[PDB]
Design an enzyme around this catalytic site. Sequence first.
Site, PDB file in Angstrom:
ATOM      1  CG  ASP A   1      15.904   7.848  21.491  1.00  0.00           C
ATOM      2  OD1 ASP A   1      16.428   6.745  20.746  1.00  0.00           O
ATOM      3  OD2 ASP A   1      15.734   9.053  20.964  1.00  0.00           O
TER       4      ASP A   1
ATOM      5  CG  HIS B   1     -10.849 -10.676   6.136  1.00  0.00           C
ATOM      6  ND1 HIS B   1     -11.004  -9.579   5.629  1.00  0.00           N
ATOM      7  CD2 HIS B   1     -11.787 -11.208   6.830  1.00  0.00           C
ATOM      8  CE1 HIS B   1     -12.271  -9.353   5.638  1.00  0.00           C
ATOM      9  NE2 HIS B   1     -12.962 -10.380   6.537  1.00  0.00           N
TER      10      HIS B   1
ATOM     11  CG  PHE C   1      17.117  -2.418   8.107  1.00  0.00           C
ATOM     12  CD1 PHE C   1      17.590  -2.322   6.785  1.00  0.00           C
ATOM     13  CD2 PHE C   1      15.970  -1.540   8.176  1.00  0.00           C
ATOM     14  CE1 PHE C   1      17.097  -1.077   5.889  1.00  0.00           C
ATOM     15  CE2 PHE C   1      15.447  -0.800   7.673  1.00  0.00           C
ATOM     16  CZ  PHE C   1      15.943  -0.481   6.097  1.00  0.00           C
TER      17      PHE C   1
ATOM     18  CG  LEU D   1      19.274  -0.820  20.605  1.00  0.00           C
ATOM     19  CD1 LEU D   1      18.920  -1.709  21.572  1.00  0.00           C
ATOM     20  CD2 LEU D   1      20.068  -1.516  19.551  1.00  0.00           C
TER      21      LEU D   1
ATOM     22  CG  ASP E   1      -2.305  -0.861   0.626  1.00  0.00           C
ATOM     23  OD1 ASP E   1      -2.784  -1.008  -0.240  1.00  0.00           O
ATOM     24  OD2 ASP E   1      -2.857  -1.408   1.701  1.00  0.00           O
TER      25      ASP E   1
ATOM     26  N   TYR F   1     -10.608  -0.375   1.106  1.00  0.00           N
ATOM     27  CA  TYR F   1     -10.800  -0.708   2.673  1.00  0.00           C
ATOM     28  C   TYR F   1     -10.218   0.698   3.185  1.00  0.00           C
TER      29      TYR F   1
HETATM   30 CA   LIG Z   1      16.691   4.408  19.830  1.00  0.00          CA
HETATM   31 CA   LIG Z   2      21.910  -3.657  11.154  1.00  0.00          CA
HETATM   32 CU   LIG Z   3      -9.858  -7.879   5.229  1.00  0.00          CU
END
Ligand SMILES: [Ca+2]
Ligand SMILES: [Ca+2]
Ligand SMILES: [Cu+2]
Lengths: 695, 699
Positions: free
Chosen positions: B473, B626, B605, B616, B328, B413
């Site tokens: 944080d 559904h 990542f 982090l 989307d 939707y």
């Molecule tokens: Ca952080």
């Molecule tokens: Ca990483």
């Molecule tokens: Cu649905």
Amino acid sequence: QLFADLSREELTAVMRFLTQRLGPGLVDAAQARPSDNCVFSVELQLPPKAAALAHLDRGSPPPAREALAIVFFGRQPQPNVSELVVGPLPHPSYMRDVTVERHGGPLPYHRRPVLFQEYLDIDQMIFNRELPQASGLLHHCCFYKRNLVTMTTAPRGLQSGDRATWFGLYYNISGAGFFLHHVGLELLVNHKALDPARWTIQKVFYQGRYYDSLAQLEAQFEAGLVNVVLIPDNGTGGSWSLKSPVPPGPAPPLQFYPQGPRFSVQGSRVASSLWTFSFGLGAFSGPRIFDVRFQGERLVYEISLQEALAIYGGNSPAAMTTRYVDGGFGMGKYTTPLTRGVDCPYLATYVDWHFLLESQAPKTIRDAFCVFEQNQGLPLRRHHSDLYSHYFGGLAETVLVVRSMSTLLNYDYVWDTVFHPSGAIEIRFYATGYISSAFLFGATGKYGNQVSEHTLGTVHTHSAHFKVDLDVAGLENWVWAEDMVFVPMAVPWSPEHQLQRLQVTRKLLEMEEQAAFLVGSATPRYLYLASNHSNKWGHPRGYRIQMLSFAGEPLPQNSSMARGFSWERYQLAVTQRKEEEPSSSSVFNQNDPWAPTVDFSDFINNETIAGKDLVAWVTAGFLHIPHAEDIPNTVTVGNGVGFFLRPYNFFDEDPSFYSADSIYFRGDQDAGACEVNPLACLAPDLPAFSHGGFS
Amino acid sequence: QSQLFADLSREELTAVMRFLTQRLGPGLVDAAQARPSDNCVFSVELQLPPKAAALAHLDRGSPPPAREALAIVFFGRQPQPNVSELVVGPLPHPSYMRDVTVERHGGPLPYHRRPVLFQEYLDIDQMIFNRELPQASGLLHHCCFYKRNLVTMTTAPRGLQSGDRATWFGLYYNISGAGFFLHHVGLELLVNHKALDPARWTIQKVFYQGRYYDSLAQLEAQFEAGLVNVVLIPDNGTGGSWSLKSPVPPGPAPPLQFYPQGPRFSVQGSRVASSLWTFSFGLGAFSGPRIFDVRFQGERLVYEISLQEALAIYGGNSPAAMTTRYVDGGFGMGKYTTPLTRGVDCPYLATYVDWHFLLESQAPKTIRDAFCVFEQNQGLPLRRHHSDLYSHYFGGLAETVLVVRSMSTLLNYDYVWDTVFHPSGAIEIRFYATGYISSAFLFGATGKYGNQVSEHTLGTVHTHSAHFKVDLDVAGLENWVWAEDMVFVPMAVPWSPEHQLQRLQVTRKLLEMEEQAAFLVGSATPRYLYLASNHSNKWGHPRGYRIQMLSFAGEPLPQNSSMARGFSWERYQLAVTQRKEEEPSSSSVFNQNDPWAPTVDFSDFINNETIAGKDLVAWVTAGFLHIPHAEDIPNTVTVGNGVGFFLRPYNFFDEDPSFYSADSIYFRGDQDAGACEVNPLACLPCAPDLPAFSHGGFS
Ligand SMILES: [Ca+2]
Ligand SMILES: [Ca+2]
Ligand SMILES: [Cu+2]
Ligand SMILES: *[C@@H]1O[C@H](CO)[C@@H](O[C@@H]2O[C@H](CO)[C@@H](O)[C@H](O)[C@H]2NC(C)=O)[C@H](O)[C@H]1NC(C)=O
Ligand SMILES: *[C@@H]1O[C@H](CO)[C@@H](O[C@@H]2O[C@H](CO)[C@@H](O)[C@H](O)[C@H]2NC(C)=O)[C@H](O)[C@H]1NC(C)=O
Ligand SMILES: *[C@@H]1O[C@H](CO)[C@@H](O[C@@H]2O[C@H](CO)[C@@H](O)[C@H](O)[C@H]2NC(C)=O)[C@H](O)[C@H]1NC(C)=O
Ligand SMILES: *[C@@H]1O[C@H](CO)[C@@H](O)[C@H](O)[C@H]1NC(C)=O
Ligand SMILES: *[C@@H]1O[C@H](CO)[C@@H](O)[C@H](O)[C@H]1NC(C)=O
Ligand SMILES: *[C@@H]1O[C@H](CO)[C@@H](O)[C@H](O)[C@H]1NC(C)=O
Ligand SMILES: *[C@@H]1O[C@H](CO)[C@@H](O)[C@H](O)[C@H]1NC(C)=O
Ligand SMILES: [Ca+2]
Ligand SMILES: [Ca+2]
Ligand SMILES: [Cu+2]
């Protein structure tokens, strides 16, 4: 009102009868000793289901209205507990002993809940005869002189037949929870004897070390072999108070009903343009809902709390061997008055609850139930179209709620029954109130967090068990398990290419064991009870069970006591509803789980669940390692568990389509016109505040 | 200080648009009617500041970072067409422009990755209704009241490998005042619109009520040759599947919520402040809802919480449904945000806020009432305790909550995005899906692909999943992640040796590498999982916030799919990575049309880095399966579909902050609980005049 709990009158009339039939020597349970005869409980006996549906759906006359009395028969060569059904009500004429019929024999007298007077006796022993033997130690650690109180623990002993309870000692804090001030002394009291005089102390615990008596402890201390630290008996902050030091500000939001309430409460029946149902409280099992009809059609015969269970760890004996089976105290018996504005919306309807428990006269817990409509501030549904056609259609979800709360010593359990306008039912259970604490001493890293000075927040799990008697489009239901799978196959219009092909998978579950799902193992994503009847589009009319649980690891099967709450092993289970399998626990399990008075796993026994009258059993829980943010109380946020009963092809279309509150307008309409939009159309009166009080 | 995370205003947007107009050597066409060959500005929106600079400003009083915008430009007129990402200079009055495409992507953006322009959809509907559909006027005239009483709807990816741009279009009845999505006529065209010259656009395949054809000509041939068993599908009717307006007259009014003594929060720009909370909100055009700089009682908890992507994976026996994976963001959760109908989408007395955008246009436009902010009385205690034992007292607090809501209507939707701020210090993120379902024509072995839902209407089976970025944080930037849980250790009762007890214990593990804190869907996750500082609270436990997931996730698309790296976040319930400026988002507006060659691949990542004592960021995936049913008509309801997560304080504080609430109630037994000076509630027993209803309009 077929399912209405017993009124003060009916309660009185059954106690009148009981006193006649049991030629005196019968004592008031409120002051009864172990060797006496007393009435412990008297409450509504639920009618047999067939007789009731006969009445509700076929004019047939009302099943006899009976009570069930639990009697402690201690004044005899072989004491026992008896369950006695009492004669036709309003005016009782018979009395029937169903004890053997139900259990196969007598009820061993040691399964009887500890009476209030019993706790009182135990205290007299501890405070008058046992504690003063350690007035030396207790002076240098706990400002001894009384300033202390006790709190009972889990099952009482280690084998079936034992009645030995570990008690913690706590500073008797006033106006706030004593539960946060364990003074580090724990006593194993053996009160199995019928003569309170023969009551002993089997063990003692203090700072990591065990002794055989208080004298032996006081000894080691006068011998300079026990280091004492003077635990402060006073302080400021959340640990010591519940009252906010901050002045009140502008009021929180308030909901009122512009054109009056849109539901009514008549005794124990509730009615709104969408729902009719009955509500009540089992003295021991707690909240229950009966005869739930959505727009005149019955969905469930019964939804009821079966049991609540708390399982502990800790580096003290009391905590480490604690497994409360809360029904043994009673979710209904310990229901507390609802504080208008806090526990329920201010303009909710509040109902009383009458009971005859450990007494000879009826009593009332004022404001025990609240029923109300609640604007969720959230659409039940909505669509806004900018594409091809300009229209908006939606509906703000308003919800119908019944609620009670149980305060079992510390914790305050909030029980929610929520009726959605979509045809869905929601059962929620929130655990708030105070935690149990232990005295902080030793290597507590493995059993909880330090949550205050001297206070260990002991690790534990909470679970509750629910009985869901759905009767989807009649009694004969089947259970379906629908889920998904990906099947790799060639792309039809370009067969050199592959595509992961999404598919639904349906599977009929025909045997009880197939619909028994265990905590730990995965359950199908769609699971519902169906009729053989179909909706307009040819799909089985069904109601789907959707669980909200973070269930912690259940007490290991190897435990000799694990069968006093065998339901804790199951996420969900479905069985044939039997008159002989009324509840999945019992007030008698708490005190002897090694010889369970009912063992839920017995219900799952290789029977068919294809085309019978079924009943679903749902378990919900969580683990709880306490943290600082639990001081004062644990908050409700995030700890809501339970389940949704969602319609699944039960209807032909979403019933809310025919809602009297739905909103709709096209682009070419004056959306600010009241004949186009009821929202464009157009000083609450508020009753004086009042509180149910205390006991 | 500065309102650093505010979305660009109308004049800011205008200012950037003007700046580009000049420096893009003439020929630049208004994208609202651009052709593939043209050069046009696709989108202009705020470019979020770098974190270091932003925090230096917010915390250390440094000067605020340059306020920049990012513009996506479609460069169609050239030998080697491409999409470029341009950052535009200091803003109120820009003075610089810079091309960051190769910096972010390592090369140019292949021109086929670009979203489909609204004008492109228009030209497709031209080729369909003006050059192709009449080649079958016979069939159409017989089956579907034909005589443009029909509409098209696009689908998932557009092809079968990297570089394709061939979309399957379902054809539906142009219903009015209600969803056309329920009335598929059974015809589905595979339009190939890769070519830059729309004249060169072809139809690669045809699908009609169960059968494949090579053209609408061949299908027309077979029709008049009496060789096709045509099933007649009615083009109107009555019921929920044909209407959305209730046949029932309004009854007595639903409950209304008001603030007895005035409001208790304030919105000023994009910033909200109550006594407990301050934060900033906004919408990314493509990523959607986002929250910045959340502070509880003055202290920051999360730097950013933001939607990253929304997914929809389908099944079915029609070729459209059967191959549809919507990503989307490729359409834009902000771009498709819609006005909130006061009283329906939010409490009537909520505070509503407009949103401004420059998208497929050259002048800024406004979605009126795009956000709502309100206090909600939950009708539930936050905490309470009634004491009948030893000492008689009651102490409790009814939970009132702070909500920011926006909804995106992506074609059929409506997604409702909630950000809920609890008085306890907890943050709740919710995602409800409502509106109409996407459907197919009912024909075949529908059992494995959904349920019959209306006459001729198959509700196709699909999965939902949204991805959330949670940059906590916790008590500073340096965080660690902890996994705590339970365990039973069989041992002997210390005071009764020949007896056994199942010893309950806590287990604490430090997750140190990104992989240790990545949890795939379907494997088990620690009951207690939290990010923490190494700083302790008063009781010497690590100050932490835990992530509690509310998800019923379905099966992620299997990895063996060449397109599954376009949303590899779907395979994770939760993951924790080192936060990086170059890892700003886990998805891209550009993944939709080339998931085979993903512009960003979230799995990247997770690459064997420490997460011990670093800035982090947690990534959370909520969703569910559904299988559409009857109660999804006309729209699917929100009940039971709320997925998301809680951020809950775990030894962050020294006690529960709600202890100091202004709204808490308390009284001893030996007090008059009906007296004002003991119980604010007693002093309760006027309601406000209401603003005239107004609505935000349409496009
Ligand atoms: Ca952080
Ligand atoms: Ca990483
Ligand atoms: Cu649905
Ligand atoms: C525990 O603390 C409460 C707090 O007051 C004590 O309450 C009182 O008990 C005395 C004893 O007779 C009564 O006279 C008081 O009037 C009670 N005060 C009120 C205001 O509650 C309680 O008794 C203590 N309980 C014991 C057994 O330790
Ligand atoms: C992507 O397309 C743009 C537009 O043509 C290219 O940018 C132009 O690049 C030429 C040479 O670099 C310059 O003369 C123009 O000044 C640039 N125009 C703009 C607005 O930057 C761009 O180089 C292409 N990028 C790549 C990687 O293909
Ligand atoms: C599709 O259906 C809608 C029917 O509501 C048509 O929309 C109307 O179109 C007329 C002009 O022909 C406009 O003046 C009306 O304002 C439109 N109504 C709405 C509420 O927008 C639409 O014309 C039809 N178009 C298609 C592509 O078939
Ligand atoms: C059983 O199912 C049939 C169809 O299989 C249904 O029509 C009928 O109502 C049901 N009959 C019963 C429950 O006796
Ligand atoms: C269950 O009962 C059936 C009789 O209907 C029997 O055939 C089967 O052996 C039983 N299964 C077990 C495990 O006892
Ligand atoms: C946190 O950890 C860092 C280094 O790993 C350290 O230098 C700092 O002192 C620590 N803070 C503590 C343990 O309070
Ligand atoms: C990850 O990095 C560590 C060094 O800290 C190294 O020992 C290990 O081999 C690496 N693992 C992989 C899979 O690259
Ligand atoms: Ca049933
Ligand atoms: Ca059975
Ligand atoms: Cu707990």
